[PDB]
Design an enzyme around this catalytic site. Sequence first.
Site, PDB file in Angstrom:
ATOM      1  N   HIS A 136      53.070  -3.840  23.091  1.00  0.00           N
ATOM      2  CA  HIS A 136      53.652  -3.394  24.361  1.00  0.00           C
ATOM      3  C   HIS A 136      53.396  -4.417  25.447  1.00  0.00           C
ATOM      4  O   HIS A 136      53.898  -4.302  26.564  1.00  0.00           O
ATOM      5  CB  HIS A 136      53.074  -2.038  24.779  1.00  0.00           C
ATOM      6  CG  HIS A 136      51.667  -2.112  25.290  1.00  0.00           C
ATOM      7  ND1 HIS A 136      50.574  -1.769  24.519  1.00  0.00           N
ATOM      8  CD2 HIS A 136      51.176  -2.491  26.496  1.00  0.00           C
ATOM      9  CE1 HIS A 136      49.470  -1.934  25.226  1.00  0.00           C
ATOM     10  NE2 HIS A 136      49.807  -2.373  26.429  1.00  0.00           N
ATOM     11  N   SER A 169      43.888  -4.040  27.715  1.00  0.00           N
ATOM     12  CA  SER A 169      44.892  -3.659  26.737  1.00  0.00           C
ATOM     13  C   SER A 169      45.230  -4.785  25.743  1.00  0.00           C
ATOM     14  O   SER A 169      45.384  -5.939  26.125  1.00  0.00           O
ATOM     15  CB  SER A 169      46.158  -3.211  27.463  1.00  0.00           C
ATOM     16  OG  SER A 169      46.990  -2.472  26.593  1.00  0.00           O
ATOM     17  N   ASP A 228      51.752  -0.056  17.643  1.00  0.00           N
ATOM     18  CA  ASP A 228      51.699  -0.934  18.811  1.00  0.00           C
ATOM     19  C   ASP A 228      50.866  -2.192  18.562  1.00  0.00           C
ATOM     20  O   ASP A 228      49.863  -2.421  19.238  1.00  0.00           O
ATOM     21  CB  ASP A 228      51.127  -0.171  20.009  1.00  0.00           C
ATOM     22  CG  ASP A 228      51.127  -0.998  21.286  1.00  0.00           C
ATOM     23  OD1 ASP A 228      51.896  -1.977  21.363  1.00  0.00           O
ATOM     24  OD2 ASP A 228      50.360  -0.666  22.216  1.00  0.00           O
ATOM     25  N   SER A 264       1.114   3.565   2.225  1.00  0.00           N
ATOM     26  CA  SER A 264       1.687   3.901   3.535  1.00  0.00           C
ATOM     27  C   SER A 264       3.110   3.344   3.680  1.00  0.00           C
ATOM     28  O   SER A 264       3.953   3.926   4.362  1.00  0.00           O
ATOM     29  CB  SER A 264       0.786   3.391   4.680  1.00  0.00           C
ATOM     30  OG  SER A 264       0.544   1.986   4.598  1.00  0.00           O
ATOM     31  N   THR A 312      -5.299  -0.150   1.683  1.00  0.00           N
ATOM     32  CA  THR A 312      -4.765  -1.225   2.523  1.00  0.00           C
ATOM     33  C   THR A 312      -5.845  -2.192   2.997  1.00  0.00           C
ATOM     34  O   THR A 312      -6.340  -2.095   4.126  1.00  0.00           O
ATOM     35  CB  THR A 312      -3.988  -0.695   3.763  1.00  0.00           C
ATOM     36  OG1 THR A 312      -3.068   0.339   3.383  1.00  0.00           O
ATOM     37  CG2 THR A 312      -3.206  -1.848   4.426  1.00  0.00           C
ATOM     38  N   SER A 327       0.825  -1.215   0.000  1.00  0.00           N
ATOM     39  CA  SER A 327       0.000   0.000   0.000  1.00  0.00           C
ATOM     40  C   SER A 327       0.859   1.265   0.000  1.00  0.00           C
ATOM     41  O   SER A 327       2.079   1.193   0.193  1.00  0.00           O
ATOM     42  CB  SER A 327      -0.961   0.024   1.202  1.00  0.00           C
ATOM     43  OG  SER A 327      -0.262   0.120   2.435  1.00  0.00           O
TER      44      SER A 327
HETATM   45 MG   LIG Z   1      -1.242   1.125   3.978  1.00  0.00          MG
END
Ligand SMILES: [Mg+2]
EC number: 3.4.21.47
Lengths: 614, 362, 233, 693
Positions: free
Chosen positions: D465, D633, D510, D229, D302, D227
């Site tokens: 590290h 870490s 690192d 919408s 709809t 539809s």
């Molecule tokens: Mg509709």
Amino acid sequence: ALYTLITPAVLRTDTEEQILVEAHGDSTPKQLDIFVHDFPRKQKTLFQTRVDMNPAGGMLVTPTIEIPAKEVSTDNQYVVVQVTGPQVRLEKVVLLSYQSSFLFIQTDKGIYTPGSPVLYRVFSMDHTVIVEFQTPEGILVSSNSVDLNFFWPYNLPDLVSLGTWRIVAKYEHSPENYTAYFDVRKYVLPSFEVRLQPSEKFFYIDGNENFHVSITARYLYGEEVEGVAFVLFGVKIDDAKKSIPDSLTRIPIIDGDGKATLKRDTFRSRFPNLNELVGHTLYASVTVMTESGSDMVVTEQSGIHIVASPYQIHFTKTPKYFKPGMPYELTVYVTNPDGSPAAHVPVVSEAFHSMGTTLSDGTAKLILNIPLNAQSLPITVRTNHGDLPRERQATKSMTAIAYQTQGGSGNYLHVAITSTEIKPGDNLPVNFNVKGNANSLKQIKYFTYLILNKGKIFKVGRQPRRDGQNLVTMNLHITPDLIPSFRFVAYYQVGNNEIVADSVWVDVKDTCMGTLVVKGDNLIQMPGAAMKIKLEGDPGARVGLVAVDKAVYVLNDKYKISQAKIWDTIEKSDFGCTAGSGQNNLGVFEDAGLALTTSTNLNTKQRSAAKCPQ
Amino acid sequence: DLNLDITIELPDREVPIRYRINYENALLARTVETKLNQDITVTASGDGKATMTILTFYNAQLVCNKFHLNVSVENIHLNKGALMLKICTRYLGEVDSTMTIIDISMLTGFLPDAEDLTRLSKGVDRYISRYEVDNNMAQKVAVIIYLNKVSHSEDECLHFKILKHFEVGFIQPGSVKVYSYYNLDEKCTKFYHPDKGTGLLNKICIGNVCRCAGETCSSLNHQERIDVPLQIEKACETNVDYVYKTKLLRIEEQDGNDIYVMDVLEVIKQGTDENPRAKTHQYISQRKCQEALNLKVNDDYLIWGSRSDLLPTKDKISYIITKNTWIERWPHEDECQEEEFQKLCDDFAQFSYTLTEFGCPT
Amino acid sequence: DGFIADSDIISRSDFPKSWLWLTKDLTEEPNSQGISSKTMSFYLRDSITTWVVLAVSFTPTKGICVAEPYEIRVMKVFFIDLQMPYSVVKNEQVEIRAILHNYVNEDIYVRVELLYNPAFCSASTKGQRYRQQFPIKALSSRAVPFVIVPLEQGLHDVEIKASVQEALWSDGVRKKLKVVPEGVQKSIVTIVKLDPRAKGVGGTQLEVIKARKLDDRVPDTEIETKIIIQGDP
Amino acid sequence: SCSLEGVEIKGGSFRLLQEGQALEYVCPSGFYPYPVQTRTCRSTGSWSTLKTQDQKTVRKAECRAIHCPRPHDFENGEYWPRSPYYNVSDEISFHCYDGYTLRGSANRTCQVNGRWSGQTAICDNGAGYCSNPGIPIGTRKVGSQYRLEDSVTYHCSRGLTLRGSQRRTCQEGGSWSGTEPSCQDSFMYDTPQEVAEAFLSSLTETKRKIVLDPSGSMNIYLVLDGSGSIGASDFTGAKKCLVNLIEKVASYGVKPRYGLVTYATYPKIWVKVSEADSSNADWVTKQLNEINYEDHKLKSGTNTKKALQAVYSMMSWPVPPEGWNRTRHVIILMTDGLHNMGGDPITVIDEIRDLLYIGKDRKNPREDYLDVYVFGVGPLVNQVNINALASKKDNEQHVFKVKDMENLEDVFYQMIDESQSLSLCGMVWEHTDYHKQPWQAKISVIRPSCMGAVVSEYFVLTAAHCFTHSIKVSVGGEKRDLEIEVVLFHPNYNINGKKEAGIPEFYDYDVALIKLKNKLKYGQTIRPICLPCTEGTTRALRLPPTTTCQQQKEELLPAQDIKALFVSEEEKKLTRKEVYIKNGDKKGSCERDAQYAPGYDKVKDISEVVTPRFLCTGGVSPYADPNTCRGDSGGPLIVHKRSRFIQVGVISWGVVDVCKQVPAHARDFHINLFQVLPWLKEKLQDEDLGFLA
Ligand SMILES: [Mg+2]
Ligand SMILES: *[C@@H]1O[C@H](CO)[C@@H](O[C@@H]2O[C@H](CO)[C@@H](O)[C@H](O)[C@H]2NC(C)=O)[C@H](O)[C@H]1NC(C)=O
Ligand SMILES: *C1O[C@H](CO)[C@@H](O)[C@H](O)[C@H]1NC(C)=O
Ligand SMILES: *[C@@H]1O[C@H](CO)[C@@H](O)[C@H](O)[C@H]1NC(C)=O
Ligand SMILES: *[C@@H]1O[C@H](CO)[C@@H](O)[C@H](O)[C@H]1NC(C)=O
Ligand SMILES: [K+]
Ligand SMILES: [Mg+2]
């Protein structure tokens, strides 16, 4: 030469029971066998131990026995306690009780609506148990073995019998039980509470005075109620209430306060004949409505005894036996008509010129000197309150009887406690006083004494006596274990043949044995507020909690658990029946709740029931 | 000894219930519950005896028990929008009722006239609780009058003016209750309202099922031209179940309600009812709305509404007219020639065409 | 307009007669005097009332201890008090009489609204709450009647909200109204004696209880059958 | 079109869509548009009025704070704390009275989708014939008796909608009829993970199988609202979803017959169960790719009832065919629930239940033979309506509403990923802890704790590290700690590189790769995470084989604030932390906070310590970010996209050690993997990862 066995006159199942076995005139060490068998068939050995009796122990032993409820079940039951050893064979048949301890039920409220859960806990003074619900018609609708740790809510149906329900908690096989109550009603909580204050706690049956009830009406959040009250007075004769219709009165409730009055004239017109009033109570039905008519509360001032005196004298705390030629301690107990203790009341026995004034526990001890030759002792006591005419003073008479000495020996024992308002922590002088034949008395080397509490032997001891001493004093330290009261039983023996006994009942200040306080900040709160409270108590305490709308109590406040109910229930179950002494040596043991047997066959008589006569 | 085997077979469940009853559990009552009223088969085998009680609870077709009470309210002229409240009551017992109470609630926004209340409060036989006064009005929305007694032989009447304190959109009915000290059980209450003979809020009942009818009246929609796109959007809201063209066949009355009997001529937008043209449609309203609805027998209408407003009427389709109901006059075929209706008719034809041909837009 | 926004008014609804049914263990180290403390946090329910907190303890050597009640006092300076009847009958118009309390020592102007509930016919509608505005004097109360017709059996919320102009004060209350079917509740009582020895075949007794004859019955109202069995001593 | 006069929303913004016939409000995270999110253009040139759920008019649109429903009641227990309203990330806990036992979640947390985590808490004494049904948060229950044939009813506070069953009845079998209710507000939505799990779990029985009668059959009806919408964008999105659903279903080895229907004013039947090809997935899929949104452009109303009548007609028969009572029927409905023609669609559901003889014989209710699922599509979903059509089954979910269409697609993408092998990178199925982060590695080195990510059977990627037989590595949450073979540091790494300039630690480049001695065995708790510029990640993002490395970077790391996450261990428990990478206008200020880091007091120009290799998170703009702990870490910084997890950085270092009241300068720095690709491509060349360049 003299072997003796002392037990509680009633033994409880499943609990520590001290007994007392002694050898007098024998300093030879012995292994003693202790048995307990079911009586009369002795099918089984319920309990068995062995003890060492030696000089170092005063030739005295206090074994603990225990009778398992599961070994002796199935429908008055007795057991036989037996002590055997070299030269020793003692036996005593003793009544059994299935009440292993004292149970108390707490419910979340005293009143419920249909379709709601009743929450409950069962507490035991010493830590199984059957819990039952019965309808108001007395129908059993629930029956469950419970563990004292986990309880099952009872869900009230929506179609449910209205009225007062019962919960009953009991050990199985026990005719005793604890019963609690709750109401089931179609109610809504009121928004305010009504407090009533009578002008006096009593009403003179032949008085001239009017009676008033002051009414205080406050919303449960604390503010004053404005409205109207309708008050109707009447007299409650047993179950039935006979109202005084012309007493119906309507009065304003302004700023939360009002006063309703029953005129004496109106009372007399309705109840002219004094006979109809004797033993009965006045009541006032108070119905308060708020000014807007949005709410109503109905309550009642009851239990206003219609009496000829404001006081009552009781002799329930004084022995009914005396020792000729020894001072007799007369304990006078004065109460208000509702049975609360009356403090600061003067009392007098005129014939003895004895005066005293009652203490906060309502008692006054008077000492009466008794002539050597008396066998009977009439006593009359009356209140002597300065504000009362003689006709309003309370009075009461009794006759005490002389303790009969064994074989006419003239040998006596008197235990004297002078202390008053006794509390845990105190140090109490106990006096042992002897009287009798010079040659008999010189034979006395010691007194045996037992402290009895809540039906048990709690402690046993020996008090030495150096010859010459007709007075021997001992200190007794009072501990919380002796709440709510105890008995001090004592005896000496002469020539391995004669037993001379006395006892005293000693009240202890009723409190918790331990400690429990709920502390908060005491500030006014907003709905939904975060709270903090501190629970202060003994280490390891298990604390059951609940929060109740104060409005619930407005509808019903009769059924709540409390410490005073606890102590009162325990006292009502005492195995001892009297306030001390006895008709003779055996009487002293029997009346104190002890059984006695000896190698000379001096035996206390069989006990009828666990319950002391009415 | 006592040894009973009980079997209960209920239709509402395959597995029967079984109890044993012996000496040990004999005291315990056992209950089973069913929400049906059907056959119950019970079997008992063994030694003992028992009593079986079957309790069937239900509601059966059957208050102002110990008092009679009349209440009315009237307009009066004060030179205001004052009203006059009148109350008459009598006790139905055999002696006068002692300590009687007349419990009065005000119409919304009204308060008692202070002078009249003071007049009423006089006498050695009455009591009215304390009240403040402002603008000749007693400051009590609920007023209680306590009587030393009310007669069982003759009506006792009273009256007093009530004055307008504040205005509201709608005035709620007031009420009057009567009861007494020895009959605080009594449910005796009447309502009053200046526009309703018995103070009742408007409802519409089909048997025992009632619907709130609203205190506000719906009114026939009038528009000299239809904004067709806009009208389409209104018709195509998700809560609009159907859109019909109807003719009004008859207007019927019953229980203070109008039944507008509609024939469905055209389904413009199909709703939940699958064959509306097959059966006649009753549209129900309170007679208070008569004038504002202004419907004419044999006129045609555009009607749309919500499925919510369906009534439980057996063997007829009936709706309650509510604010969700849209009613608009649809010009007759012959009216479509007048210049008054010409263009409006075009609009209706276009509205109809769009919906039936293309449907709603979204 | 000068009033609190409705969404900013959170209605009070939790009004239990009893609560906090819990158990705590004094697990902490005793102080110098043998006393162990336990700090406990919780939140209050919604009632404007005084609560009484009751504690009961047990320890093996100290038996049972019932504590003195601890009171918690709850209050607002401005609030609605709503006393409801235990039940009301379906389809019967009834008046509910709320009380508005002003415990502020000054005069106020207030707005009060009854919320729409599809289960009732009242002055409120789905589109529009029934609203009133009126003064209340300093430190006074005012009855506020609401007229409703219950349309559905069961329990249904009544909700009233109020606020004070140009002040923070507001209160809302949501309480359940109990609605019972019309007519009167009756019981049909059928007593059957079970006694197989005297009434059975081979020690077996078979009873069939037919559907009960009713239908003086209000249509679509519920029906409950209880079958109770009681052994004879 | 509609004038934009007075449309603005207090606190947020708006964006016009569908060329000006609809507008969408945009609110900051933690907020939502009140009273509605989307408006439509009226015929009058005026925007649709702002309406609350009660259909009460609102004059001004404003961005409001997200709150999870307040408890309206909780039986036989207490909860903590009690508040007027509950904020996102707020926690609530429940505790039963004495004598009652707790079921459901004792601790529940308020989530950003307006829902409480976990399962309804119930305190139950197990006395009823049925269990205590409970009180989902936000509802009120009427009925406290739980005997056979007792009922309870639920309601939500007006303003919210009831999803699930308003009434439930205690049945002979011990369970409650219908399905547990919940309260739905306008901003609330299901996560794609929740929906995938709920749907697949409802549809199948558990690997998984679709269950049918012995000698059984299955019909699936795909029904798509086309539809006006709905809109073209969502419609096409809904198509893709259905295409993927067809694939998923096919994996189960059953041959359902399909129905394929799109509808507006009228239904268009593209496939009928009666066609020979209706059990032909490739055929059905072909037809599906045929559907055009323009097909319903003219007649764009709809009529959902009529669509459902087309399903009914496919099920009906001319006496009934052999084995009719044997077939299992599944309706997949996609609509916004805003039906406006044909009336209440629920009446068709009842007709279908009548036809299939469902819920008529209490001895054989036959509820297993029909499932109706409804997925909310379109800009404005009517919850009451989509819920009304969906099946209500105990412990199942049949109605779903996600945030938007991209999220709906993720549902179906996740389902397809579910079947595949464990080597599928960055894929987690939300059923533990390592179940939720199976890529996570804990690294322990003993010297007189770092994290890592599994990137292949041999390799764990972490921070350099972390290091200098010493190094142990554990995965899958196992006591077992694995032997390593060698650590490869990025060749440009040197922590002491600037030592003599007064800069003690220099974190550039690192990153380090750990090669295990033995190959990992993939499982429930051990899986690899996707890396940048690989085939796996091109496929994770659902992109074509022609996608370039630059195109991946634009997708994963746009010049914007980037929602991301990392995994922190808090008390032996892994937990996801939501952070924002400042890769746009905030990048500069995030980076400059580096000069308040310890050791960096002498630094004169932050470019000396913050290089182009770094990504930056933390701080208070745009939102207050959580910070990494020392333990975290070396761990992965992750972007969660199209239902998949793609590592974009390695956790390196932070400005402030906050392991709250955390300072505004508390940033975290991470190595950007896009910046070390040549090392990565080179070192992992033989891992079957399929790098691009
Ligand atoms: Mg509709
Ligand atoms: C959610 O957030 C709000 C703050 O926006 C908290 O507000 C409480 O209630 C009002 C403010 O509306 C204040 O009077 C309180 O003092 C606030 N809470 C405090 C500080 O005690 C609200 O409590 C939050 N909800 C939570 C954290 O559960
Ligand atoms: C009540 O009824 C009487 C007749 O019995 C009538 O005279 C009177 O007017 C009524 N009272 C009212 C409606 O106020
Ligand atoms: C409990 O004790 C008393 C004794 O009369 C009474 O309430 C009742 O008989 C007993 N209840 C039992 C044992 O169930
Ligand atoms: C709920 O939270 C508390 C901490 O706030 C935790 O101790 C408890 O274990 C939790 N209950 C769970 C996780 O089931
Ligand atoms: K009274
Ligand atoms: Mg005492």
